[PDB]
Amino acid sequence: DVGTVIQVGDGIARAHGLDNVMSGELVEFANGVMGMALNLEENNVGIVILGPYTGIKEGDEVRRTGRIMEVPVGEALIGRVVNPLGQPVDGLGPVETTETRPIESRAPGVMDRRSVHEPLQTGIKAIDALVPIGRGQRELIIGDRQTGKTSVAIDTIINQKDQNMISIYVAIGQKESTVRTVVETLRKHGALDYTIVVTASASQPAPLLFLAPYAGVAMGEYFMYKGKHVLVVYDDLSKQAAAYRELSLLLRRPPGREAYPGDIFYLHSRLLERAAKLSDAKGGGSLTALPFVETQAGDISAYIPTNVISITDGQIFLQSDLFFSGVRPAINAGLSVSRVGGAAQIKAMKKVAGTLRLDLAAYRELEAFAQFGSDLDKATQAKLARGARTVEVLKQDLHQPIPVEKQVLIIYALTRGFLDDIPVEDVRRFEKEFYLFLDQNGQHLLEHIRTTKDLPNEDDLNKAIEAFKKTFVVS
Amino acid sequence: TRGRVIQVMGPVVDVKFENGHLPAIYNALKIQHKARNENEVDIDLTLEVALHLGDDTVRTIAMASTDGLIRGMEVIDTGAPISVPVGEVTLGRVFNVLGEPIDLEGDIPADARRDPIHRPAPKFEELATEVEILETGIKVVDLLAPYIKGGKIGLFGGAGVGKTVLIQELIHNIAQEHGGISVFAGVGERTREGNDLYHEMKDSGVISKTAMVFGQMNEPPGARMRVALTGLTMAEYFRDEQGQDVLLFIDNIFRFTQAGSEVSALLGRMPSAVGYQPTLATEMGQLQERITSTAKGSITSIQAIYVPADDYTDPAPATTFSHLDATTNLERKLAEMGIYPAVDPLASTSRALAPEIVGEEHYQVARKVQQTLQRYKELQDIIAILGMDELSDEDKLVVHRARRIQFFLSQNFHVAEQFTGQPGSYVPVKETVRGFKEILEGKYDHLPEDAFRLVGRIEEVVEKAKAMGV
Amino acid sequence: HRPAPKFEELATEVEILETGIKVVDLLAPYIKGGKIGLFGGAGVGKTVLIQELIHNIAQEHGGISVFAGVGERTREGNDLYHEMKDSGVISKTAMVFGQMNEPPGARMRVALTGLTMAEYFRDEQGQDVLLFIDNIFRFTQAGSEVSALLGRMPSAVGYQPTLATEMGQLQERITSTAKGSITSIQAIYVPADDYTDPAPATTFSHLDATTNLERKLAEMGIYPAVDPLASTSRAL
Ligand SMILES: Nc1ncnc2c1ncn2[C@@H]1O[C@H](COP(=O)(O)OP(=O)(O)OP(=O)(O)O)[C@@H](O)[C@H]1O
């Protein structure tokens, strides 16, 4: 079972011989570069190159391996940075291979799943209160370039220290220096205890770019089937989509609507359907996914955004104008919805966070009108004041996930009208001082929130917040 | 006969069998393989022929992943198109495209009836003159947009505005009052609906008759294409052999064109239109034309269809829309008002009975209803700008009656009994028209508006108003 | 043509580069090892800004610099050469030119040869080298022309199938290791005042700081023509 390379060019070679080759089998050359056989003509094989193709020459010997695109998985991979082929990237010696599994396996089917009822905490007040996410749900994040997508993902992975989760971060076509910066930022805060980072940077060939998310999801699926919960984040699926387009074009397949071929919906939906919430019959695993999609000029209506958004269970939209203006983070209620949310959210938050949504929307509309027109009625002015305080509460600083209990308590304080007296800029100081006061005085409320999952004794909570108001000093 | 594999090209597969006596187009070939040594992988695959080539080669399409296929492996041809198992034995379970149940409750015996999927549409000889209206038991549907049996229905409703409740009620009614069974075939997202249908239609028992067929996005293009045709063969068995007065349902048409979007990727041939396959109209027509009434048996394959594309001028929505017969719309703003089902006066066709046959009263009532609703809409526009109090008495009376008319549209669904607790009401079409006529005639102008909610008949409105202690 | 630097080698530290220009220093600081982009229409002063920045850096900081002209106008190249010779800066810098009247392959490879000059300076002399590139737009155009000649199917707006990869390589060999920065300042032209053409978007994905020049400022008395609000740097 030996062959010779008869053609080479821009990553797609051809080979003569290889009688017993199997479609999809890993194949390797005398140079040592790995290749994926894709097409088997009547007397020659079409090989896609995974690695540097410069070294290859026609007449080179090619050898089959006998495996069908297996990616190593195991416990050793936790905390490491690895290639989609599974090779170590950050030195530190070779990772131990517990077992090897293909990446072309079938997704979890119908009647083998379960409705989502378990919360997943990101740590951002606005997200956790307005747009909850459940374990096993797929939530897409879209925004203009430079809007904090990576900051939100890092905040979620950092907050996942408390709750059992195996997090896998997949960097597709990202700049290498940013990848290393994120790796070090996860090394601090201890996030590398459980996180696995898979990287395939822009320099890597397009086949690796399109193969990376498949390898990451394949790695997560093993912890899914053993029973461990998983959270996988794709830094940007658009790079995978583009790298797919390029490979098909080089292989001479005709384009579709745009330069993208018709396959892209199948390619991305096969990836995204692989995340599921399993039932008791299958071990009860879960795999949350938070894909990211790039948006030009803030125009949602486009081929890739609609194509992917048709697949997911919801999406969150971040506006760059609000972000740059000083509202960080920034989410628009109109375009952001979570269809699976409400069942995973703990009852405490569901009770606490009822009027906040209506206040945000109605106040924002009224504020638009008011900045248009000065003269107003007294009730509208009171609504404006309440909305201003609400906007002030929602603001959150960088790399500081907040535990849920403080969120629900501060949202309760905001909604009941205790916070209204505090001036705008003093609201943030009020918030952090209230967190310190909660650590100081109301511990039993926090423990009752932890254990019960419901709002604690309301009278004592009212007394505690009133006492904090009595202690707090304005201006 | 037996033939060997020679080529593989991934999803289009393009296996060029070298054979002695070729199989016809659409025939089924099955591959069985065992792991002779460590390298080889056991695979069991089914393929459908789609094209003949020079010499003995016959192009095929595989219904599952081809990883592990090796040149030289032997292939056996069945002799007929892929055979769905169908009949009494198959009723009451969820199938894949090929014919095996996905849920492992039981396995179909080999002795069962198996029929080919691909069949020519009914000849012109066996068709029947179509004038009659199917009864739905839903007041708004029986008053504004009736459904012609044997014809494709369109419902443009977003997910979460009552689509599942509406289809559950339709299938429950059609199995309660008629002899019709339903068939469902989805392609999109997650089937949480399986448990809702399990609850209500297994309490009713119709679940034992509805033979759902599922193959969704994760599947290769071939299965996603042929799923709808399997679903249709399910109905074809009943209509041909059973010949009962079963005016059955099949609940997806456009999803075949949504799969046709991927069939454009399945082709591997010259592009046309906007990247679409050249044969878009023909491929869709072949499916659509198999739904007909007939004189062989009282089986009308009337289908309710949801169109996710919802873009007017695109070639595939336009081509599908050309075949539609009736249309309905579900909107969230109407869902806000508590009026269920959330259907608005939008309608299409359905004039085969009214006023064609006689249908005078029904047609005039419907026209007055739509006219009054549009007048109320413009009056509501005026009210916000300036105020209702300044309206004249005769114009105010229009809003007065319009409120009652708007609220009467609600129906207490039978399926809602497990949440609301209301037993549920079924209304005949003639009863709907006759009762509603008095509302337009102002027989009950004095009754409070709140009585006109979630009741089947006008006498129920009167008795509810009485129960309010007038 | 050389394999890229690996993951373990790279550093992450941030160092600001002072230019002495009020707008740039105040509202869009540049970073050692980072890539800085200059965007704008025709006749707004991008070449004047890059040339005066070269002079200012060589005058005050005194670091080595390399200039790569990808398809530069022969008239502008000769005027730049004479201006730098008069300035006494040429001795500190180095220049490589790929002329427009040359086959597209040479106009593609000229940026890589300039990068190789900066590479040897940074690897052996281990200091803060700078690399100026005249225009990436013509680099992408040359790539498209070479692909069309070679017989590859077009994509996007007539562009070559392999665009993202080539841009990524050219901008990922420019990385600041522990030894040396290889900071780059790059200018790009917007064909129709729309920031959506594939080349501007692909380059836009790679930038740490972007400074965009407006024709209205250029025709106003305000020199240089830099829009404050739309110019941003992630090191602010
Ligand atoms: N809540 C916040 N308050 C203040 N600054 C913030 C906040 N969230 C994010 N930022 C800052 O905004 C920037 C966001 O950078 P980030 O890499 O996350 O962007 P991105 O939108 O994901 O873009 P790209 O896809 O190009 O990486 C960072 O400089 C980060 O420090």
Ligand SMILES: Nc1ncnc2c1ncn2[C@@H]1O[C@H](COP(=O)(O)OP(=O)(O)O)[C@@H](O)[C@H]1O
């Ligand atoms: N800061 C400035 N000082 C003086 N003249 C300027 C300045 N900026 C622009 N100009 C005028 O505009 C022209 C700039 O040319 P150039 O920098 O090549 O524009 P572009 O980079 O848009 O091609 C000069 O010829 C000069 O006359």
Ligand SMILES: [Mg+2]
């Ligand atoms: Mg980012």
Ligand SMILES: [Mg+2]
């Ligand atoms: Mg210029």
